[PDB]
Amino acid sequence: DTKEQRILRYVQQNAKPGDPQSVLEAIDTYCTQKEWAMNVGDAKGQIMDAVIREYSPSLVLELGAYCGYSAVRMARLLQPGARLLTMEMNPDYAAITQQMLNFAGLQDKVTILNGASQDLIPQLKKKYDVDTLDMVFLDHWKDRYLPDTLLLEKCGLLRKGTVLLADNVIVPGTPDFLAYVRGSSSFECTHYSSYLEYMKVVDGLEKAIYQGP
Ligand SMILES: CCNc1ncnc2c1ncn2[C@@H]1O[C@H](/C=C/CNC(=O)c2cc(-c3ccc(F)cc3)cc(O)c2O)[C@@H](O)[C@H]1O
Ligand SMILES: [Cl-]
Ligand SMILES: [Cl-]
Ligand SMILES: [Mg+2]
């Protein structure tokens, strides 16, 4: 058994099917009382909720689902008919995420794509019928934030006004990404200071809005 499987089982044993908030609470409780895990957490999660409500995106991409905590957060706030695509390379975690979303009742709003972002991003247009993305949440390996931002642009998936939202810009940090977006005329950036999930350690989210080529 893995820690990720243990989180899923705790939600199944302690939350209410079809109630996303109960799922989020259960995961937070497990990760605070039993075993830490790299979910975005409630502190940063409340900032993400405020961003999602401000922008009301019709199509969101998440890079790195993990166990589906942030996918539950985001999908529960989507307007009716809006959609989330979430990419997760680890097949075990992809299945956990699918089951988390099923449990929460959010499965009709989300598509969980099992594969690496560098493989799946170039397929979005033709295979997933994407035109452009309204919002992207970056939460995968930190050294892939910049490569994948640049791939998304190459592939034509960013429009003027696409909102990038990046986790962990302080801890662990993503120094190439952060320097790049902050220094580029192609992005307008805002920093939201917060705390690392389940810890009294400063972290933050970066919002970087694409300005066009
Ligand atoms: C290969 C790049 N493309 C990818 N495409 C799809 N899924 C990918 C990809 N990379 C990684 N994944 C998945 O994203 C997840 C990985 C995320 C990496 N995150 C972190 O390392 C992380 C780490 C911390 C952290 C902070 C403090 C610490 F002391 C220790 C760890 C906190 C966080 O919030 C984090 O997000 C996994 O589910 C992984 O399988
Ligand atoms: Cl998460
Ligand atoms: Cl937290
Ligand atoms: Mg993170």
The C-alpha atoms of residue 84 and residue 110 are separated, in whole angstroms, by 5
Report the candidate in 43, 2, 50, 4 with the shortest Cα–Cα distance to residue 27.
4
Share of the chain residues as helix, strand and coil, in percent rounded to the nearest 5: 50, 25, 25
Q: Kindly provide the resolution of this structure in angstroms, with one decimal.
A: 1.2
The C-alpha atoms of residue 40 and residue 134 are separated, in whole angstroms, by 20
Residue 138 near residue 176 (C-beta atoms within 8 A): no
Burial of residue 211, with CB atoms counted within 10 A of its CB: 0-12 exposed, 13-18 middle, 19 or more buried: middle
Residues 6+ apart with CB under 8 A from 95: 114
1-213 folds as: Rossmann fold (3.40.50)
Enumerate the domain spans of the chain: 1-213
> Could you give the residue numbers annotated as active site?
139, 142, 167-168, 197
Beta bridge partners of 88: 114
DSSP string, 167-178: S-IIIII-HHHH
Residue in this structure with the two tokens 């295979």, named with its chain if needed: 127
Which residues are near ligand 1 (CB < 6 Å)? 38, 63-64, 66, 87-90, 93, 116-117, 139-141, 144, 167-168, 171-172, 196-197
- State the method: X-ray
Rg (CA), the chain: 16
Q: How far is CA 179 from CA 26, 92, 169, in A?
A: 36, 33, 10
The phi and psi torsions of 75 (rounded to 5 degrees) equal -65, -30
CA of 170 to the centre of ligand 4 (A): 10
Residue 87 near residue 61 (C-beta atoms within 8 A): yes
Residue 106 near residue 76 (C-beta atoms within 8 A): yes
Report the candidate in 25, 29, 18 with the shortest Cα–Cα distance to residue 103.
18
CA of 39 to the centre of ligand 3 (A): 9
Structure tokens at 117: 């972002």
Q: Determine the 3-state secondary structure of 144 from DSSP.
A: helix
Report the candidate in 32, 82, 20, 15 with the shortest Cα–Cα distance to residue 53.
82
